[model samples]
Target: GEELFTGVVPILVELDGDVNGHKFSVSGEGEGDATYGKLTLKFICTTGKLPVPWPTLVTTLVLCFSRYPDHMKQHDFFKSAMPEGYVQERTIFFKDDGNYKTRAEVKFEGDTLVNRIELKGIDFKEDGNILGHKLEYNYNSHNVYIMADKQKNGIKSNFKIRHNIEDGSVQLADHYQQNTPIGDGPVLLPDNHYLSTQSKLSKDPNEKRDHMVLLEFVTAAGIT
Candidate 1:
């Protein structure tokens, strides 16, 4: 049993920022960013707090939305135009289930259905009043795409959006919660503090954990 006395041994490796510095990069997939980008070795991406999920998440959305054509939702039923009994059925479904229910008014134009609400003084690039969020959809392609104007970082950033709905997808009549705009901002994001603690993870040069953090977000699970 005397041979068992030499059991404890320590392991060590040399490091010089490259070990974690390279991966601690914001560009790393699903990793946190105390620093999103290194702007010329002098500054971060923006002036203030980081837009963690938006830069990656919102950017992805915009690309997808662009791929979905406006005609996909509403097809031209009568040669570039096209419902009253059909309208009545949709009226109950539209207002009874989706976010447009209490906040918006639903109407149809030819073949397209307009689901929108009016708003005043929403963005800086906007004028007197914005025409609310007019979702002129023609879901023939089985996809839903919508856009909204927003002001942030003292610039008229293009709020190009794309929902996670794949190429051929559709939302059910009673399904209203899965898709919705969650926490958003760059520096001018909504003034709210929910995950206020995670920011510090990026604040330090090296998190010193000696290991990177990867969280697989089952995104489609919807904020539930």
Candidate 2:
């Protein structure tokens, strides 16, 4: 406690992805209560199939930026697009519940192969864990969307109906041991999908890529 240290603008992003290739990652951008005003934040990420689930990645922030921005929290979201009969074991670091879980599950009834996710502990913003919705995939002429069934998840929100592209050719700029932090000129995802990293601790706070990768893990770790 250095005599009420203030003015030290701290920025962080928290990632809650899984060990599986399905990236349902989440992140955030915020500062040390500037005592001034809200700093605008932008996000950028690569194109093509995510190494993991992407929605949870988005939902993470939509939920975090407003609710758990600073809470050492844990939440679970689902995904698909994994190899057949895929299974893995790892520590559930999200809330340190030390639990493990996610995978893309489709309807047992349908001639279509639906790739979707199922979220847990989400109820009307996870406010009551009373939210539950099934995302049905829709693809059309370079445009895609998710139809939210809105089974229950409390007026469901932050969910998007967007694009999902597939590419057999995708490469990362460079990948450190997953221990590497972001905002050092290279992003966590590592690609030029107009993507880089974004955070308050950004070396080039003014630095802007065509797009950027928001690292929640970076937010949680803070300048390492």
Candidate 3:
């Protein structure tokens, strides 16, 4: 069966502080049905610094997501959380020229929500090379819980994580998603992977090498 979901909500922006003479704001709205959702954010810098040469001025927007607590949650605690019961459709906005650019990404897990967003504005160039860039802002919202029964588990924890980005830096962030199934389905590991232990002795000599065993169990239990 096909259904249509539609709604309108007021957008809100909260100003943090000034950074390098630029005043930044984080704003977004949540609307629509349980299956269809939309979130729009606008990052503006009042500083009239044009790093590049453009007639009407140009701005850039970037959104980054990680499991890091600072970037993953809206607050230090669980006072407020991510919007539940919906999925973002697509992010569309108007450029300075009155044209719109649409960008979208799907959630790999039900509880997955936007962790962090980074926006910037640079001088407009015909060749697509950014001259001087000013970081407009970075923002994160409280983690959203999709189901009511899982509310308690949605609280932010202090677990630490390490990520190896493409730039080759071993960065540290909170590992809130540890031991949780990601990728839109049951949990599974690669065939050759195994749990590591400092001690080299096995408790069970007959325990077969079973990488897919846990995945099969969770799938049969209908965890997703």
Residue 99 miss distance in model 1 (angstroms): 6.0
Q: How well is each residue in 1-224 modelled by candidate 2, as lDDT tens digits?
A: 11111232334333334332233443334442212222333333323232332332332331111111222122101111111111111112222111223222221112121223332221122211111112212221111111111232111111112323233222111111011111121111211111112223122356443233332211222111
**Candidate 2 runs further than 4 Å off:** 1-11, 19-50, 53-56, 62-159, 166-211, 214-224
Q: What is the TM-score of candidate 1?
A: 0.14
Model 2's C-alpha root-mean-square deviation from the true structure amounts to 20.3
Clashing pairs in 3: 52-123, 74-141, 74-142, 82-143, 82-144
- Candidate ordering by TM-score (highest first): 3, 2, 1
- Candidate topping lDDT: 2
In order, how many clashes per candidate? 10, 26, 5
Alpha-carbon RMSD of each model: 24.7, 20.3, 20.0
Candidate 1 residue lDDT tens string, 48-99 = 2221222121111111001112222221111111111011111112221222
Reference-based TM-score of each model: 0.14, 0.23, 0.24
lDDT (10s digit) by residue, model 3, range 1-224: 01111232323222222222233433322221222122333323233433322211111121111111222223111112223211111121212211112122222123233322233332233332223222221111222222221232221122222323234433233222211112222211211111111101112235342110000000011112
Number of the predicted model whose TM-score against the real structure is largest: 3
| TM-score preference between candidates 2 and 3, better one | 3
Residue 184 of model 2 has an lDDT of: 23
Worst 10 contiguous positions by lDDT, candidate 2: 76-85
